[PDB]
Design a protein around this ligand. Structure first.
Ligand SMILES: [Ca+2]
Ligand SMILES: [Ca+2]
Ligand SMILES: [Ca+2]
Ligand SMILES: [Ca+2]
Lengths: 636, 636
């Protein structure tokens, strides 16, 4: 970077030189009128070139060489090392008229060289490298660079800042800046609600870290210490990317020169680092489970025993939560979503919370904020996929919606915008609005195929249920009763025959199968799936006044997936030879693939099933091995 | 694109098939309970494959082949041509039990194949190609594709739509859609203020074009005509890219299926085209001049004669405007900016207008909308440059501002955001706030170097002026008077001596030279310029109470550039040997390069110069040869 510094007519100019730049110096303006030629001397650590009309020649420390004074003949001044107290760094120019060889005047330039660099870990190894050339930009991908910031999801201490990103101002120079200079760190007003920066202002009084840049604070004067010095700063993001915010923020340091009272200080030198705030990322069912969170009323005993029995088959831990006055029966599933953030140095799980009425341990970050489509039961994410050559290494988020011209329900714009702005999960809208409750988790899920890197999409299917019931009826099982053991269902005496003879229910369910198939098609298209990747599980629905579906028997597709082990809601289907024909059919689909099924009874405690489930579960999983910053998202 | 269509248990399914998709067909659900195997027949133009566990085999129109009924054995159905009235396109499946070879039941699929494609010119040759595979995306660069929309900068006629982009819905099929289908064109609520679409609703009553999509209209049912048909639509952009709007809009067509009253129609098929609205682009001084616009009071005769004499040296035309009650003296320069838009089919010049108090021919588009930094005298644009390997083929926009921590003036956020959002001119902020008026055009300009592809940056320089005056004084010209012929200046008797002896003015101008040099450095950095690319023109300023500069004599850098011919404000400098020493110095810098200087007197009519200019000029230029859509802007 070339910088303009002029000799001043009949006077000495003193200037700070910042390493990494060089000066072009006009010597012609300072020349007395009538002067013909000039000569120059310079000190040991200043390099001087005479540049005439583009041709540059190096000049010795003390020569007698003379050049013609011309506007197009200038100096180029370079220094390779910072000044110390033993430096006298200078360039002196003498001027001659046509008569004598004795100088008629002279103009000097006295320099103080310092190194100033604002450093960040832009190469993403967790360590702050010296002056990364790319630190002022942010690029995606394996070869991409630029520094990463975590949102802080919780006078300050040193230990409390462990989760933040380091930024170090490295300097080198003599004992003091020359008179009239100061060093200032600053951010834009716009970024002031995106970021915060801490540092110890008075280190001789302690380690106390104070907040010097952020809301209401746009600049901070930093104190210069001579010799080689580093000032350590810690930087936090205040918010995730969103509709109006790309995720990118900038921090600047400038050397400012005092001009005079009432006049602004001049930015002699400025160094800039850029940060991207790490996006919130969701974990699909194929990722290794860590903890299983469940919520149920205190007395649903079968549910708790059977869930505990399931988790004990695995290496997961169980966390049991009970119901709250301000939260729904399903709140652990509907009001909470487990996701994570990651920076090169650190990452942690981060929970999104949307309490029904408003307001899990210290290891978590917590992000807290309308129709039923706003619930997190309506939010899923696929395993990693490749679609038409385009890879989605973190998978794609799935959100239930209604047809564009339908005038039906849709997730709120704020949440939709938030998910889109994370960019790395490239969300897809499905059609959930044919369901009374309206959640994609009522009709679909994903399971890994054990012993491989592959996965299956599981889809609810009414056609599968009707085919099975018609077979069993043909086999002479038409009188087989459902809901055995639910006393509140008994007076209904629902059998396979009674179900198959109900004409309006048949038509309702043909319609719901169209709804499911429309989703099947979008899923195959947007996830790059074929029919080989999909298994259909029998389901059945009843229609409400709005022509929307609610489960006739518990939806088995919404299941706890812990690797090979699947907790599947107990369907209470018709009993053939003292086994539920629905459980037996599902085992026959899944077990040959190495998946182990355990049916979990969440409804017996209520004596009947009206289409609503009173328990919920959510699984916290390990993050992807693939680093998000290695992705190359499409330009938005 | 694969689409799910199921045979229905004991009944015929009728469906529309859209060319470019194919169907996967479950035959197993429709099978009676107890059925073992199936066989199939199909018509001539339907292709059928039996796909079992992934293995697909083609099946003849009438064979006797049987396959085992399995959930994993399905059909794949394909058609290569649209149905006509002579078509009977069908697939019939028969079912057998274990006993007989006579079918126990059958389920059919009756198809009507149509072609539906929403076509745009996505390959950017001005003609609408059939179904461009990339029409649903928009990519920059030489190899980039996707369609371009012009902002409309002005019942409808056919001729009035000449400036819009064409979009054609191409269909092929039999005389009518089967019962319960309709075709609908639609846009999102969000895009509804970005776009508008016209078309003739009732062609049998005339050619009258009506507005069917846009503000308040999100969808339009289009009438289906049989045979090969095209419906022609015209599309206009309503606004330029801006802070919240990328410039991209989408238009959809869907085939919708009627389900039943009270239930939404199902989107059977959807085709999407994307448009980018063309950005507003500025023209730098190197582009060929077309018209020169000037404004002055009616009686400034010297100004008009000399400007006319200048333009007559060129092939440009002169347009003379006079002053208005609602506009400043300089309004043609300050309140108006000439730029252009371009699409493959058409482009036109587009003027930005910001009248001082609020509110050029039919060939122009007109875009109409605070401190002096908001004026267009504060807006410039560089010739094409390459900086550190990064090319800016349309140059870069330059905007004057104040230092970040200064608390000084800045152009309004709205205008700044607008310029940034055009993206193709990648704007740069300079420092203009040291000037009372605060316009970059007071201190800098660009000129081509005749006979080459190169250009120069011209910078005002106070150091150049002082050097020249000190020489002339040394030569014995110290008593040479300025402002000769301005009667209102006479009593001041300003000479070279009086100027050079004024100590505070010397210090003020050293300070202003620092301000100019700070700009020089940013310009060199952001435009990739060296000292070889820059010429310094003498200037001089006086300081006001705010420590800001106003011209002491007319700023020569703000000049009319028509190729080799430069209209330069007459400086009224000191007379040496009956020539202005400022005019002679400037000729000596410029003329050797082939630039022809004509000095234009805009101040004599006022009898004195206080730092304000009462005339203005603006030049309309030919657009760049380089097409904007060929650029590859940095991802924002
Ligand atoms: Ca590093
Ligand atoms: Ca969820
Ligand atoms: Ca074309
Ligand atoms: Ca302008």
């Amino acid at each position: 970077r070339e910088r303009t510094v002029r000799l001043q007519y009949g006077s000495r100019v003193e200037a700070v030189y910042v390493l990494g730049t060089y000066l072009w110096t006009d010597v012609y303006s300072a020349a007395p009128a009538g002067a013909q030629t000039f000569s120059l001397k310079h000190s040991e650590h200043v390099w001087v070139e005479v540049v005439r009309d583009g041709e540059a020649e190096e000049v010795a420390t003390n020569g007698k060489q003379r050049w013609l004074l011309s506007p197009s003949t200038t100096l180029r001044v370079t220094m390779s090392q910072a000044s110390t107290e033993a430096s006298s760094d200078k360039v002196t120019v003498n001027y001659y008229d046509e008569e004598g060889s004795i100088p008629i005047d002279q103009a000097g330039l006295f320099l103080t060289a310092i190194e100033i660099s604002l450093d960040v870990n832009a190469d993403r190894d967790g360590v702050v490298e010296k002056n990364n050339p790319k630190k002022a930009s942010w690029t995606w991908g394996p070869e991409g660079q630029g520094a990463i910031l975590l949102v802080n999801c919780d006078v300050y201490s040193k230990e409390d800042l462990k989760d933040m990103s380091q930024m170090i101002l490295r300097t080198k120079g003599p004992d003091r800046l020359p008179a009239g200079y100061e060093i200032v760190l600053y951010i834009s007003m716009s970024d002031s609600d995106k970021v915060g920066v801490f540092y110890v202002e008075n280190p001789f009084f302690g380690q106390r870290y104070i907040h010097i840049l952020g809301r209401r604070k746009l600049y901070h004067v930093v104190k210069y210490t001579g010799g080689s010095a580093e000032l350590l700063f810690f930087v936090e993001g205040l918010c995730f990317p969103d509709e109006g915010f790309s995720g990118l923020v900038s921090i600047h340091v400038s050397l400012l020169e005092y001009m005079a009272q009432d006049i602004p200080l001049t930015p002699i030198f400025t160094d800039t680092v850029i940060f991207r705030i790490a996006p919130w990322i969701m974990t699909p069912n194929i990722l290794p489970p860590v903890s299983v969170f469940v919520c149920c009323m205190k007395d649903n005993y079968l549910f708790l025993k059977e869930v505990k029995n399931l988790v004990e088959k695995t290496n997961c831990e169980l966390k049991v939560c009970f119901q709250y006055l301000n939260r729904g029966d399903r709140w652990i599933q509907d009001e909470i979503e487990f996701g994570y953030i990651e920076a090169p140095h650190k990452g942690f799980p981060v929970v999104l919370d949307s309490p029904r009425d408003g307001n899990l341990g210290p290891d978590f970050g917590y992000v807290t904020r309308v129709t039923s489509l706003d619930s997190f039961g309506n939010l899923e994410v696929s395993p990693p996929v490749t679609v038409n050559g385009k890879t989605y290494p973190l998978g794609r988020i799935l959100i239930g919606s209604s047809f564009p011209l339908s005038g039906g329900r849709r997730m709120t714009k704020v949440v939709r915008d938030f998910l889109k702005a994370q960019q790395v999960q490239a969300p897809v809208e499905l059609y959930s609005d044919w369901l009374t409750v309206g959640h994609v988790d009522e009709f679909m899920s994903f399971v890994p195929i054990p012993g491989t890197k592959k996965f299956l999409l599981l889809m609810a299917s009414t056609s599968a249920c009707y085919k099975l019931f018609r077979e069993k009826q043909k086999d002479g099982h038409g009188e087989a009763i459902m809901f055995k053991g639910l006393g509140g269902m008994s007076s209904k005496r629902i059998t396979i025959n009674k179900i198959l003879s109900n004409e309006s229910l048949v038509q309702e369910n043909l319609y719901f199968q169209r709804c499911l198939d429309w989703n099947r098609d979008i899923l195959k298209k947007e996830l790059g799936l074929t029919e080989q990747d999909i298994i259909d599980l029998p389901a059945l629905f009843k229609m409400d006044e709005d022509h929307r579906a609610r489960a006739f028997f518990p939806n088995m597709v919404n299941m706890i997936v812990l690797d090979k082990d699947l907790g599947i809601p107990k369907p209470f289907g018709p009993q053939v030879e003292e086994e539920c024909c629905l459980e037996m059919h599902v085992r026959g689909l899944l077990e040959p693939l190495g998946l182990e099924c355990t049916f979990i009874d969440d409804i017996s405690a209520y004596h009947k099933f009206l289409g609503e489930v009173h328990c919920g579960t959510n699984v916290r999983r390990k993050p992807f091995t693939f680093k998000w910053w290695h992705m190359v998202p499409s330009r938005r």
